[PDB]
Design a protein around this ligand. Sequence first.
Ligand SMILES: *[C@H]1[C@H](O)[C@@H](O)[C@H](O[C@H]2O[C@H](CO)[C@@H](O)[C@H](O)[C@H]2O)[C@@H](CO)[C@@H]1OS(=O)(=O)O
Ligand SMILES: *[C@@H]1O[C@H](CO)[C@@H](O)[C@H](O)[C@H]1NC(C)=O
Ligand SMILES: [Ca+2]
Length: 476
Amino acid sequence: ATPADWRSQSIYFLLTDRFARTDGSTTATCNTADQKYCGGTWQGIIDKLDYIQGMGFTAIWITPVTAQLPQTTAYGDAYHGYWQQDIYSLNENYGTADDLKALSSALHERGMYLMVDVVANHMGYDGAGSSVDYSVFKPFSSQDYFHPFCFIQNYEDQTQVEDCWLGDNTVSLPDLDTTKDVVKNEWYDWVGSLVSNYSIDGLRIDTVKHVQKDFWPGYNKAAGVYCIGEVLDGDPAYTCPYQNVMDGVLNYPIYYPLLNAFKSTSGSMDDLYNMINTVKSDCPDSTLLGTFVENHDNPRFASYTNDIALAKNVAAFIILNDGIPIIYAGQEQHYAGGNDPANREATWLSGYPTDSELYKLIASANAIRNYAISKDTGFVTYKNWPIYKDDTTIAMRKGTDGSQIVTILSNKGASGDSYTLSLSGAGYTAGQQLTEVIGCTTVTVGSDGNVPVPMAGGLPRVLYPTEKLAGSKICS
Ligand SMILES: *[C@H]1[C@H](O)[C@@H](O)[C@H](O[C@H]2O[C@H](CO)[C@@H](O)[C@H](O)[C@H]2O)[C@@H](CO)[C@@H]1OS(=O)(=O)O
Ligand SMILES: *[C@@H]1O[C@H](CO)[C@@H](O)[C@H](O)[C@H]1NC(C)=O
Ligand SMILES: [Ca+2]
């Protein structure tokens, strides 16, 4: 599927090992500190697609599928998929080639997309760099395919960032020499044939800043689908230029101020407001970025605060910002694990309740986004506009005049006071009825064009014209 096709999608990101077992158990042990395979599979995902689609996601992102180093290392198993050895075999822990094809087909029957995580930068190996037997790597079965062994120490030296190895002396990540035509040609053939064998709709490309930029146009073209890159840097002047070589990147620039704004009742709305406007202006296309606050490489949102109002607001922002929403399996059950491995909790241990507070919030927010997109072909290309901020509030507008979603978010938290915010710049006409689609109340635009927004409980407010909701299932 093309970049234009992906703009309307909403992604549920999951670890194949951690989301759902074939046996469907909600009690099978998964101690994250053991760092071992817990037994999640592709078949398990298929069996729980109603759970994912019930929150109004249109797509899933799954962790890498290639065969891995076999060892239980000092840091545990390759459960996560980022330690590959044989790129032409699958990780048998997750199932068979027919199971991965059955997952793609099950998503397609539901009108959903499959996105697969891929690594081009590195293989994995149990042990020090000097102990590597290069013959285990397929097809790269020679030291001749790799950069000489060194670690990245100077992260300001972009040459060192690209040419030296990730990992450490315990688990090494042998660095492919992606400047070699033979390495480019194998990777380009591989990614095209992976996409066509498993009918994959899009790719999440890990580790993009560790491979020189001239590799990536050819890779994105060989894949034949939308690619979103992991460029792990909060500076839009570093990260956004990668969109000149790849369709999209993960929005790490928004990540840091978004987390800061909502993790505390003292968070900076100014930093978030300013970063939205920096990304909108200075990134090649904000509408092809991926918005997130939670992943398997940072502490979960609830590890910073268990306030459920704050969690509702940050989830609403993720769904209503420019670009593709990305929610990490467990976020919807308010999982609170810290840094790796504590943030790789099994989703099944929640019991997959569809009545939890954040399942309902995310369902409500995806519902209005999906509905608005179905009625407004300009929604996804209208650049999100922050129209108001104060010490505890940000408000933003997105969509075609007359059909715009106007979102008011707060960091007051669950003990926030009850008051009316008089909101200017929403763009609706005097006397217009709006539905607040999270709580299903109505507000009326005043003769002056200001919206009197009832604020209470620190709750997020998402406004849409009541007249435009004719025939939707929203706030029935
Ligand atoms: C990207 C991927 O998103 C990230 O999770 C990868 O980390 C993996 O490997 C490290 C190092 O061995 C483990 O500590 C971790 O548990 C495991 O998930 C990462 C490195 O392989 C990927 O690349 S990047 O370093 O983020 O660029
Ligand atoms: C896809 O299948 C083809 C034909 O059997 C094969 O040549 C190729 O290696 C496969 N690619 C992958 C990534 O498995
Ligand atoms: Ca590299």
